[PDB]
Structures are given as structure tokens and as C-alpha cells.
From a paper:
The ProQ/FinO family of RNA binding proteins mediate sRNA-directed gene regulation throughout gram-negative bacteria. The RocC/RocR system regulates competence, a specialized physiological state involving the coordinated expression of multiple genes which allows the bacteria to uptake environmental DNA and integrate it into its chromosome (i.e., natural transformation). RocC binds and stabilizes RocR, which in turn binds and represses a series of mRNA targets that encode components of the DNA uptake system.
We crystallized and determined the structure of RocC both alone and in complex with RocRSL3 containing a modified stem-loop with a nine base-pair stem and a tetraloop (RocR9bp-tet) at 3.2 Å. The asymmetric unit contains six copies of apo-RocC14-126 and four copies of the protein–RNA complex. Overall, the hairpin-tail RNA binds to one side of the ProQ/FinO domain, largely through interactions between the protein and the RNA backbone. The hairpin portion of the RNA is bound by the N-terminal portion of α5 with supplementary interactions from α2. The N-terminus of this helix hydrogen bonds to all four non-bridging oxygens in two successive phosphate groups—C21 and C22. The 4-nucleotide single-stranded 3’ tail (5’-U25U26C27U28−3’) adopts a hook-like structure. The 3’ terminal nucleotide, U28 bends back such that its 3’-hydroxyl hydrogen bonds with the penultimate phosphate linking U26 and C27. The terminal U28 is bound within a well-conserved and structurally rigid pocket that is formed between α5 and a β-turn at the N-terminus of α4. The pocket contains Tyr87 and Arg97, which are both among the most highly conserved residues in the ProQ/FinO domain family and together recognize the phosphate of U28. However, how FinO could at once bind to a hairpin RNA while destabilizing its base pairing was unclear. The RocC/RocR structure reveals that RocC only binds the 3’ strand of the hairpin, leaving the 5’ side unencumbered so that it could be peeled away to allow duplexing with a complementary RNA.
Numbering used by the authors: 14 to 124
The structure:
RNA sequence: UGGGUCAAUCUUCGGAUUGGCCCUUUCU
């Protein structure tokens, strides 16, 4: 049971690393972190076949975006009227006042 | 966030827990 939980963490690394390698404008946090389009998960799962070719499952792509968006740095960039971007960095929407408040609320809760 | 399914351990045998995969959920 000790190792069965480690393989899930590594399977989630591989999942998030695959996202950062194929869609860097959104998930390569070395360059920058920016708000993601609402419904980006649907756009990502349209590439589920290309990700399966390297071992990354649909459920693990979901588990990776969850990890990516619960980081404090992601919640910290959810500021009112910051641009949400698609998988290629293109502007598609803006962050609403409610969404910006809920984020700063989650940040305060943590820590 | 909920649901299905397979595998492992356990059970006071009513069940419970961990993990894989699929569907699904305002801030993805």
C-alpha cells in the first residue's frame, strides 16, 4: 500500500509534465502562470489520444489540472479582470469579480 | 463533486479501506 500511492503521484507527474510539454502557454509554469479558460478540461481531453500514446490517461490529466490549479501561485494570479487563456495563450475571457474573491479567500484559508 | 467498473487487503460477513481505468462536477 506504501508504493501503490507513490505510483499515483508519479503517474500524476507524467500527466502534468505532458501538459507542460505539449501546451506550454498554459501549463509551463517556468515561463509564467496565467488563468485558464473556463472549460479548458474539455479542450485537453480532445487530445486524450495523443496523451495515451505516452501512458497518460484521461483520469490522470484531470488529476493533474487539479494539482496545477490548487497551487497557491495559480490562485494568486486569479485577479479581477485578468485574462483567461486557452491552451495556446490566446485571450478568450476575463476573470469575474466573484471568481477573484473566491480565490483570495482560498489563499487566506490556506496557511 | 458524485457515479460505474476491475485489482489488492480486511471483516463482527451487514461490509469497510487503498489503487488503476471511464463518465461527470461555478471558480479546469
Amino acid at each position: 500500500n506504501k508504493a501503490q500511492k507513490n505510483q499515483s503521484k508519479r503517474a500524476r507527474s507524467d500527466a502534468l509534465l505532458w501538459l507542460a510539454a505539449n501546451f506550454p502557454e498554459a501549463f509551463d509554469n517556468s515561463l509564467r502562470i496565467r488563468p485558464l479558460k473556463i472549460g479548458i478540461m474539455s479542450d485537453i481531453l480532445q487530445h486524450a489520444e495523443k496523451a495515451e500514446q505516452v501512458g497518460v490517461s484521461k483520469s490522470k490529466l484531470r488529476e493533474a489540472v487539479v494539482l496545477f490549479t490548487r497551487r497557491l501561485d495559480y490562485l494568486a494570479c486569479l485577479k479581477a479582470r485578468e485574462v483567461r487563456i486557452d491552451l495556446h495563450g490566446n485571450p478568450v475571457a476575463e476573470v469575474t469579480e466573484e471568481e477573484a474573491e473566491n480565490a483570495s479567500m482560498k489563499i487566506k484559508k490556506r496557511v
